[PDB]
Design a protein around this ligand. Structure first.
Ligand code: NA
Ligand code: NA
Lengths: 302, 303
């Protein structure tokens, strides 16, 4: 539950008929951000200020949205909302809020022509609250599918999931993940729980089929899992980027194949600018991986 | 003149009252793209698909916009236009266009509250045409300023410039650049042509003043831009397009000082053609792109 971390609120905007939506994490306490875009097919906005050799931005929130490339419009909707509320870096003549965002492709279920837009991004910020939030096919996970080797008709439902890992000394690492993976999702035993299905109804085992020579028939094939991991420790920008990089290891333990040519897999990481809690980044990063992994499964047990 | 390259059209949208705008380069022939974000303060969209280890996107156009972070909304305006015209990667249920973009900060001149938005991005696309285009304080360069050590009040005007370098065999490399640089711009001699000014109008020499201890008083200085497109009519791979973008920054370094600072969002996009008979070593193309970018920086402030 991402809101276990100080100052985070989460809001969803959900169109259950068109099967799309977006989710925003809002930071009421200032954060230190990092990112790792590992997939080969990612569409993002504002990620350049999240790298260690950039200046320290003032991140107001981070968005996970449907709509493929079109859905980054909802991030501008969020930016507009926040400017109206008086948030963002103060340059005197204005305040400049920043809402980095990544997308999933969800156009092949429900309505292809409805995507998160300026109004829907604003709706998600209006809805943002503390405490527990809904999981499953909601917000950015509303049109998420898993296992697309034979196209979306043989896929399983994906969704939005969350988990919190507790370490010593009051330290927490939480994740919120939207699973729309090309590959199959397995539990900690190694059982397929969501994935491409044969016509006859059983899980096909995407990786086993591809080794035999079955060809990727997904819509993007001719040329995603996205999330946020957050901790109540203090980080530097370098550590936040290292944390985001290690979190991908969690994804690799749950999803196979991962980081393919149709996947836009992206992890955002945050720590708090003011906090007395510190810990080695290699441990935080390992916990981030575990939380990310657990969140992937949470997504499909709703 | 960026439109000297096969298949490129350029359109501006200009708000001369608010002092902001955007410029789009539209690709009627399929391109191979690359990018190098070198500044420490860049705001961009869609750049991940432009790296060598990403899949080959279908880039419909690239936009240079004002408006700081808010201006990337014009890029989504362009995306909507192109979808309606039937351009973009065909996914069966839809076509998905892509319009990578980078911004300058122009909110400290004219009106801070007007920025390129969905409609302004659409206006630039509608206006996109072949042949010669206007330069100076137009389009993405409308609210551009140069030399902000002492704030925008003592700066010089920036703008949007372009240049073509001809090599052997019909090979061309062209550049289009929006100069909004923190630093001063110098000619090949090392004379200052645009830069931070003392109150009475003489050039202060930004770098000389900083070495003596004058402190950055620009709006963005408390957190601790030149943007452009270089294009060639040669066929490139994705690796070569990114190498071209990386080398092109060298041209910026020859013209602008300081460059790549903590208040600069310096970003160069590079394109080559997917279909062309023309090839050449990327290190030579890269050097010509540097020269083109340098000449375009100067064009921006003489027009
Ligand atoms: Na949909
Ligand atoms: Na302005």
């Amino acid at each position: 539950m991402l809101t276990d971390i100080d100052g985070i609120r989460v809001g969803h905007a959900t169109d259950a008929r068109a099967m799309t939506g977006c989710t925003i994490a809002v930071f009421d306490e200032p954060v230190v951000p990092g990112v790792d875009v590992r997939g080969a097919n990612a569409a993002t906005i504002y990620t350049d200020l999240l790298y260690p050799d950039s200046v320290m931005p003032s991140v107001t929130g981070i968005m996970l949205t449907g709509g493929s490339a079109f859905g980054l419009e909802a991030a501008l909707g969020a930016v507009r909302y926040f400017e109206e509320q008086g948030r963002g870096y103060d340059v005197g003549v204005a305040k400049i809020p920043l809402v980095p965002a990544a997308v999933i492709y969800d156009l092949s279920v429900g309505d292809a022509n409805v995507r998160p837009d300026l109004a829907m991004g604003r709706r998600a910020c209006e809805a943002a609250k503390p405490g527990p939030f809904e999981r499953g096919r909601v917000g950015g996970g509303t049109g998420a599918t898993v296992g697309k080797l034979y196209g979306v008709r043989q896929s399983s439902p994906g969704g939005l999931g969350t988990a919190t890992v507790s370490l010593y000394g009051g330290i927490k690492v939480s994740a919120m993940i939207v699973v729309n993976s090309f590959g199959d999702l397995r539990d900690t035993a190694g059982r397929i729980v969501a994935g491409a299905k044969y016509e006859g109804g059983e899980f096909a085992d995407t990786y086993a089929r591809m080794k035999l020579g079955d060809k990727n028939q997904s819509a993007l094939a001719r040329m995603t899992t996205i999330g946020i991991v957050s901790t109540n420790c203090r980080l530097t920008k370098v550590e936040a980027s290292r944390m985001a990089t290690l979190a991908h290891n969690g994804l690799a333990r749950a999803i196979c194949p991962i980081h393919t040519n149709v996947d836009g897999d992206t992890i955002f990481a945050t720590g708090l600018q003011k906090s007395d809690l510190t810990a080695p980044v290699d441990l935080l990063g390992t916990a981030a991986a575990e939380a990310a992994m657990l969140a992937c499964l949470d997504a499909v047990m709703q």
